[PDB]
Design a protein around this ligand. Structure first.
Ligand SMILES: CC(C)[C@@H](CNC(=O)C1(C)CCC1)Nc1ncnc2[nH]cnc12
Length: 167
């Protein structure tokens, strides 16, 4: 039993809710919150900008030190950093950004990072400003992640569409 509430069950291991991931994280304080990161960990907008703002920019300060030491992530890759006031840990995962021309096949590789964590609160990778079809992203999630994933979908209209079209 865990503290996630109000989720709809899609499969054995995937759950979905219409929620603001920042507010969901603030209340649950999950072990892992997933950030929709880019390779530079520049948290300007979308989910990343919102998570970073909720940390009062501490996420960005930590991220800048990470990049200065290690260089950029790979598209499809990830790193574990602090969850600050939102979670124990933040798993920064880089899905492909269609608005930059990155290969959508890398979306499966991005979701594979979730399998290193038993339970996660996460957004749909490559959705929103990353330009992928969120319905495709949900399908890849269900077909790739084997650990327990709680998906927060900010837009109520999108949420209804994802549920109603789910196979
Ligand atoms: C749109 C909601 C309110 C947003 C949370 N907004 C905010 O924190 C602020 C306005 C930014 C300073 C406060 N969160 C998400 N933004 C994008 N994509 C998502 N997917 C799941 N949640 C989200």
């Amino acid at each position: 039993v865990n503290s996630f509430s109000g989720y709809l069950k899609l499969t054995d291991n995937v759950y979905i809710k219409n929620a603001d991931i920042v507010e969901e994280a603030k209340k649950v304080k999950p072990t892992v919150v997933v950030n929709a990161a880019n390779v530079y960990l520049k948290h300007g907008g979308g989910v990343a900008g919102a998570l970073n703002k909720a940390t009062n920019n501490a996420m960005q300060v930590e991220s800048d030190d990470y990049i200065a030491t290690n260089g950029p992530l790979k598209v499809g890759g990830s790193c574990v950093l602090s969850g600050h006031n939102l979670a124990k840990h933040c798993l920064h995962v880089v899905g492909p950004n269609v608005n930059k021309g990155e290969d959508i096949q890398l979306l499966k590789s991005a979701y594979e990072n979730f399998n290193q964590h038993e339970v996660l609160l996460a957004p749909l990778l490559s959705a929103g400003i990353f330009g992928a079809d969120p319905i495709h992203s949900l399908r890849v999630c269900v077909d790739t992640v084997r650990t327990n994933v709680y998906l927060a979908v900010f837009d109520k209209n999108l949420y209804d569409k994802l549920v109603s079209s789910f196979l």
